[PDB]
Structure 1
């Protein structure tokens, strides 16, 4: 499939609250690209300390959201929607580079992730793209992932 919801996401990613930062997958093309998003609301614990009186979604959390989206792309590209194989694999990031923050993300924003496969070889996948809010580029980054066997 090309569109996935939280329930499908929960079966692929090992991340859970309060570290699962992807709510829905709206577009996915194997070995090419993924478009996913996370809704930003004031009702998140993170906003108690970032910052009091001034809610701003952490930039590092935006990058984390892009990573999870990218790992979802890499994983589903190879094995598709397979919850089983998913429990036997782990996708952790080795590097991150070219990260730029252009606009602050706040409650009410739909943080949309746009990642594409720059290149991949074996279990090493390199993705890149931007985070967008209402069509505008809020952030950008490149990440290298390593897919390994859990345990």
Structure 2
């Protein structure tokens, strides 16, 4: 159900400044994930996006959704297994139906809601939304392949 940063670090190979999931609040195998990233001014991204107007990049929202969806796919098949995690990689083949509705800014808790749309073998198609305070800020569908590292 709940995974904290330490758990996340053992599953995902992403490190600073490209690990964009802070906590997993909900996880149903083969079904859905709810996770989040806290948004703060204290992030290097905001130096350039943009000067005097801090806006969390929309592509990094999608990236966070992908990272959530990849975590869903991996743990669905192998559970919380750091040893297997090092032998596998989840890369993203496609991204589709992306819509941005509301700008994300420092102070926002950026929540990722992804469900498994379909899966066959190592090909997993996830989809859902990014949410701040109950509102949809973005949506996206993503297709991942799981492979050997």
Does the pair score TM above 0.5?
A: yes
Q: Deviations over 1:124-145 (max 9, x none)?
A: 0000000000000000000000
Distance 2:121 2:143 in 1: 12
What are the ranges of 5 or more consecutive residues in structure 2 without an aligned counterpart? Answer: none
User: What is the Cα deviation at residue 111 of structure 1?
Assistant: 0.2
- Matched with 2:67 is 68
Structure 1 portions without partners, runs of 5+: none
For residue 132 of structure 1, give the secondary structure of its aligned residue in structure 2.
strand
Render the CA deviation track for 1:13-40: whole Å, top value 9, x for unaligned.
0000000000000000000000000000
Aligned length: 149
Query: What is the deviation of 1:119?
Result: 0.2
C-alpha distance in 1 between matches for 2:33 and 2:60: 18
1:80: how far off? 0.1
Q: Which runs of 4+ in 1 moved over 2 A?
A: none
Classify the secondary structure of the residue corresponding to 2:84: helix
CA deviation digits over 1:21-80, x for unaligned, max 9?
Answer: 000000000000000000000000000000000000000000000000000000000000
Q: RMSD in angstroms over aligned alpha carbons?
A: 0.1
Deviation at 1:148, TM superposition (A): 0.1
1:76-127 CA distances to partner (integer Å, 9 max, x unpaired)? 0000000000000000000000000000000000000000000000000000
Report the Cα distance in structure 1 between the residues aligned to 2:60 and 2:84, rounded to whole angstroms: 27
